[PDB]
Amino acid sequence: QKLVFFAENVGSNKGAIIGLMVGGVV
Amino acid sequence: QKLVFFAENVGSNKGAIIGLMVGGVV
Amino acid sequence: QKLVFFAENVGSNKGAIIGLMVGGVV
Amino acid sequence: QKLVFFAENVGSNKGAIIGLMVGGVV
Amino acid sequence: QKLVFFAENVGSNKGAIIGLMVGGVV
Amino acid sequence: QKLVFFAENVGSNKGAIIGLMVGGVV
Amino acid sequence: QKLVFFAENVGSNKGAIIGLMVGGVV
Amino acid sequence: QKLVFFAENVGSNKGAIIGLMVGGVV
Amino acid sequence: QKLVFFAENVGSNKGAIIGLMVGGVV
Amino acid sequence: QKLVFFAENVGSNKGAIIGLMVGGVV
Amino acid sequence: QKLVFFAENVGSNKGAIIGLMVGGVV
Amino acid sequence: QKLVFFAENVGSNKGAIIGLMVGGVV
Amino acid sequence: QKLVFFAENVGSNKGAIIGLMVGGVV
Amino acid sequence: QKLVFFAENVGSNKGAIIGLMVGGVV
Amino acid sequence: QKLVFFAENVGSNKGAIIGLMVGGVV
Amino acid sequence: QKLVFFAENVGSNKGAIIGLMVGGVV
Amino acid sequence: QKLVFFAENVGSNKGAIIGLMVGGVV
Amino acid sequence: QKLVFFAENVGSNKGAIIGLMVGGVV
Amino acid sequence: QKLVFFAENVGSNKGAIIGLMVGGVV
Amino acid sequence: QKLVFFAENVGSNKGAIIGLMVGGVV
Amino acid sequence: QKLVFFAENVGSNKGAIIGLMVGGVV
Amino acid sequence: QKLVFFAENVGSNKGAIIGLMVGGVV
Amino acid sequence: QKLVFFAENVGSNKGAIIGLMVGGVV
Amino acid sequence: QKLVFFAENVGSNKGAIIGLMVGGVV
Amino acid sequence: QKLVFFAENVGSNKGAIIGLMVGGVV
Amino acid sequence: QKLVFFAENVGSNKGAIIGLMVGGVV
Amino acid sequence: QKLVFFAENVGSNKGAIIGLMVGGVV
């Protein structure tokens, strides 16, 4: 009903690794 | 009902890796 | 009902890898 | 009902890879 | 009902790869 | 019903590794 | 019913490693 | 019914390692 | 029914190692 | 050799979304 | 050799979402 | 060789979400 | 060689969520 | 060689969540 | 060689959560 | 070679939570 | 070679929680 | 070679909690 | 720049099933 | 830049099933 | 930049099942 | 940058089952 | 950057089952 | 950066079962 | 950075069962 | 940074069972 | 940083059973 994904990488050499899975609600 | 995807990479050498899957709601 | 995709890569060498899949709502 | 796709790559060597699929809403 | 596709690549060597598919709404 | 994902990495060398899976509610 | 994920790493050399799995409620 | 995950690492060299699994409630 | 995870590491060299598993309630 | 597709929606507000692909038999 | 697809939604508000793919037989 | 898909939703408010993929037989 | 999928939801408010994948037989 | 999937939910408020994956036989 | 999945929920408020994975036989 | 899964919940308020994984036979 | 899973809950308020994993035979 | 799992709860308020893991035979 | 597709089936009853898709290079 | 696909099935009853997808390079 | 796929099945009854997907490099 | 896939099955009754996925490099 | 997959089965009755997934490097 | 997978089964009745997953490096 | 997987089974009746998972390094 | 997996079974009736998991380093 | 796994079984009837898990270092 509401999908808010916030990811930022500032002032680094490498970035981040993000795995997000959402589902399975009755 | 609401898809808000926010991703940014500023001031780096590499970027980020983002995997996002959403679904499965009744 | 609302698709807001925000992605930017500024001041880097490489870009980012983004996989986003949304669907499966009743 | 509303498709807002925002992607930009500024000041880099490589660009980004973006895969976005949305659908499956009743 | 509203298709807004925004993509730009400025100041790079390579461009970006964007795959976007939207549909499946009742 | 409500997906709020907040992740940021600021002032580092490496980024973070985040794995998040949510689902299985009746 | 409510997913609030908060993670940040500020002023470091390395980031964090976070594994979170939630599901199995009747 | 309520997922509140709070993790932060500020003013360090290394980050933290967090493994959290919740589920199995009837 | 209520998941409140609070972990922070401030003013250190190393972070913490946290393993938390909850489930098995009828 | 035999294609029988049966789909009906009666007494509703919304209809259904059906994707069916069949092929790859030797 | 035989494709029998049966789907119906009767006496509801929303319909169903059905994805079916069959193929890869030698 | 034989595809029999049976799905029905009768006397409800919401419908069901069904994903079925079959293939990979030698 | 034989695909028999049977799913029905009768006399409810919500429907069911079914994910079925079959393949990988030599 | 034989796929028999049987699932039904009768006389309830919520439905069920079923994930079934079969494959990897030589 | 033989897949027989039997699940039913009759005369309840909530349904069940079933995760079944089978494969890895030589 | 033979998969027989039997699960039923009759005359209750809540359903059951079943996780079954089988594989790793040579 | 033979998978027989039998679980039932009849005449209760809550259901059961069953975790079964089998594999690792040479 | 032979998996026979038998569990039932009849005439109770709560169900049972069963964890069974079998594997590691050469 | 160079597309070399080689497939042959000799001395059999059935043929093969080959799906090959290549593209997405900048 | 270079696509070399080599597949052959010689002296058999059944053929092979090959799915190959390549793309997503910047 | 270089795609070399080598698969062959010689002197058998059944063939092989090969799924290969490559992509996601910046 | 370099994809070398080597698979062969010689002098057998059954073939092999190979699943290979590579991608997610920045 | 370099994908070298080597698998062979010679002088057997059954083949092997290989699952390989590689990705998630920044 | 370097993927070297070596697996062979020679002079046997059954083959081997290999599951290999690599990823999560920053 | 370097993936070297070496597994072989020579002069046996059964093969081996190998499960290897590597990842979670910052 | 360096994954060296060495396993072999030579001159036996049964093979070995190896489970190896490595990860969780900051 | 360095994963060296060495296991071999030579001149036997049965093989060995090895379970190795390493991780949790900051």
Side-chain angles (χ1 to χ4, degrees), chain W, chain X:
Chain W
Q1 294 178 355
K2 183 174 180 176
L3 192 166
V4 180
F5 182 89
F6 179 95
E8 68 178 27
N9 299 289
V10 179
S12 184
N13 291 332
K14 302 295 192 173
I17 300 172
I18 299 171
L20 173 57
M21 181 179 288
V22 176
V25 179
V26 178
Chain X
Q1 294 178 355
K2 183 174 180 176
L3 192 166
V4 180
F5 182 89
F6 179 95
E8 68 178 27
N9 300 289
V10 179
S12 184
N13 291 333
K14 302 294 192 173
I17 300 173
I18 299 171
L20 173 57
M21 181 179 289
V22 176
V25 179
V26 178

Side-chain angles (χ1 to χ4, degrees), chain T residues 2-13:
Chain T
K2 183 174 180 176
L3 192 166
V4 180
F5 182 89
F6 178 95
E8 68 178 27
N9 299 289
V10 179
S12 184
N13 291 333

Side-chain angles (χ1 to χ4, degrees), chain U residues 17-21, chain V residues 5 17-21, chain W residues 5 17-21, chain X residues 20:
Chain U
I17 300 173
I18 299 171
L20 173 57
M21 181 179 289
Chain V
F5 182 89
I17 300 173
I18 299 171
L20 174 57
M21 181 179 289
Chain W
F5 182 89
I17 300 172
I18 299 171
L20 173 57
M21 181 179 288
Chain X
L20 173 57

Side-chain angles (χ1 to χ4, degrees), chain D:
Chain D
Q1 294 178 355
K2 183 174 180 176
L3 192 166
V4 180
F5 182 89
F6 178 95
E8 68 178 27
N9 300 289
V10 179
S12 184
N13 291 333
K14 302 294 192 173
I17 300 173
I18 299 171
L20 174 57
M21 181 179 288
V22 176
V25 179
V26 178

Side-chain angles (χ1 to χ4, degrees), chain H residues 4-23:
Chain H
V4 180
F5 182 89
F6 179 95
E8 68 178 27
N9 299 289
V10 179
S12 184
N13 291 333
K14 302 294 192 173
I17 300 172
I18 299 171
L20 173 57
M21 181 179 289
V22 176

Side-chain angles (χ1 to χ4, degrees), chain M:
Chain M
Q1 294 178 355
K2 183 174 180 176
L3 192 166
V4 180
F5 182 89
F6 179 95
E8 68 178 27
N9 299 289
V10 179
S12 184
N13 291 333
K14 302 294 192 173
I17 300 173
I18 299 171
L20 173 57
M21 181 179 289
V22 176
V25 179
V26 178

Side-chain angles (χ1 to χ4, degrees), chain A residues 1-21:
Chain A
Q1 294 178 355
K2 183 174 180 176
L3 192 166
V4 180
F5 182 89
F6 179 95
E8 68 178 27
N9 300 289
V10 179
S12 184
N13 291 333
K14 302 294 192 173
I17 300 173
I18 299 171
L20 174 57
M21 181 179 289

